[PDB]
Amino acid sequence: GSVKIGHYILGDTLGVGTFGKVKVGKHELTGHKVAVKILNRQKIRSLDVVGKIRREIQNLKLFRHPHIIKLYQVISTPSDIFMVMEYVSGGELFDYICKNGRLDEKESRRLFQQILSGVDYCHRHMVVHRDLKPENVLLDAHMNAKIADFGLSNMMSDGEFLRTSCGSPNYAAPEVISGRLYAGPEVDIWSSGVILYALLCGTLPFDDDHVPTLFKKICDGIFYTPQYLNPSVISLLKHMLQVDPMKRATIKDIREHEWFKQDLPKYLFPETRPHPERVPFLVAKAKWHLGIRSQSRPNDIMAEVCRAIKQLDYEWKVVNPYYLRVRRKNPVTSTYSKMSLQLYQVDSRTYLLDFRSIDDELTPRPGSHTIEFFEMCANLIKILAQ
């Protein structure tokens, strides 16, 4: 009575992932091998991740990419969820580098192009891995990189940041070990930069047995560059490994970089006179700023906002000391306007209030959602400035 799920005979354990256990399986007829991630339903209830697991399934089920592990089927049973995925025999890239050492320039580049194509494909689909590392990069029989273990991933949403320090410290971006907010592609790029360093040098750029020293090295953005490294790829690493996320390389920047372009396969990536309209203005400029700022104390300014929202007869739910969700009833259309508020810090004294439009899933509605948002904000801004 061997263990069998949908004609696949389950074999040895391949490993344990972020959530659940992963075992190999072999088709009883064809002998086709698969990797089966096993999620105990009671366990994903204990940890309250059922939503994370549901989104992971919904999005990863549509993914088709050469260098991302494919999800073939999700089999639900009364006690358990079986995610049947493609199987690769090469094992971890990490183990490969351990046994064979560093890879030469051409092989490091080939694998890096494959991985970055997958990292890009995810971002195009609004998904952010955040666990990227050689341990989660799998090799197939032919040495093709395969991304796996989306357990720590998340989904990018318009106007939304993500705060969850994730992944191994060595592969984590400075803002991630610092526990700050991020859009999330800049983190995957930092991780991909560390992967590139590991392929080229056979070691890790930020590593130490003293954890404070490690975190300092990461936040300083300082790492050793071996003499045998190509100056071209060194500039690439320096750009991907920028501490400042605003100065850090994007995937566009990497695709334009000369070292990356060299020998790049085509399948990896799917892709004087003044204007008449601008003539009257020239014959003839204010600087925009975000929300509203104050040098007063964060307790004083957070209290004032609550007072002012009440003055305007607005309905608001408190989430955090610095996070509010506000609703207004439209006096004409009798529908509702929704906006969220968050206080941030700028410098020692300066703090900032941020206004963000909350979309409605409601049926066609009268008035302009965009303008009603503006009007709602202006009422409060008037009070706060006065």
Partner: protein, 300 residues
Amino acid sequence: NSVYTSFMKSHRCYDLIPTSSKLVVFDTSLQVKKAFFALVTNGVRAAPLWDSKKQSFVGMLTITDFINILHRYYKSALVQIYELEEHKIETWREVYLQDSFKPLVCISPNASLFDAVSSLIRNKIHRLPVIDPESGNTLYILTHKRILKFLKLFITEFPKPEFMSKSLEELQIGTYANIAMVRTTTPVYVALGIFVQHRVSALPVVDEKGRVVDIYSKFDVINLAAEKTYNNLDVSVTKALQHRSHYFEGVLKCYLHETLETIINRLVEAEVHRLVVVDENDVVKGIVSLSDILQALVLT
């Protein structure tokens, strides 16, 4: 049907909206002088008007509204135009729109280009706001020039019907009689008055013999707000057009013997609204606008 009429039926308004664009909206309580200044600041020739009282988009504030205010309330260069400074967009819209009440109607992004071109012609408008009916947000301001540039890029690839190889004279495209035009010495105020009476896009500037030496358009008028010279309209249109003589382009023209395709190529390449039809001596025979051509193309 034809190559063009079927094409405009196929595509949706949404297909012409830029990947990322800027849209300026004025509250109707905004001081009307500030509103025209804002149009210059943003490089925008017309903007949606939003009424906070009725919680709806009312209409468009265009350069035509600036021309009307000037001609109506301009007294002389010795006294300020009080109404221009004091009025609000709504206050003047009531005075100007008191005689005739027309409710501006938006075009859905899911509607076709044939709907849009039909709406521009039927309402005799140059500015058609595209508004999403679900959200109620105004999306994009659609113009004759945007649509014709779209057709130029797309139809050149395909076969074109026999109508395109016909000469301008044969097709009878444009206005060949009662051409409203001014003289090199005509005062701006007078030219504004002609805009108000004839409701034309632009006025050819002609010499002694009727030969076009320049053109004064409705667009050119906005330069008065740019330089803040609006309070003296006594100057000639020549003095008004000195601002653009630094890089001067000879007024564009076309002939009756030229084909509609030749003319449309000249329009899109120059990115201009109309061409002055002239004879051998540059004397003004007629005017071919974008609205003329888009009416010719929307009808079989």
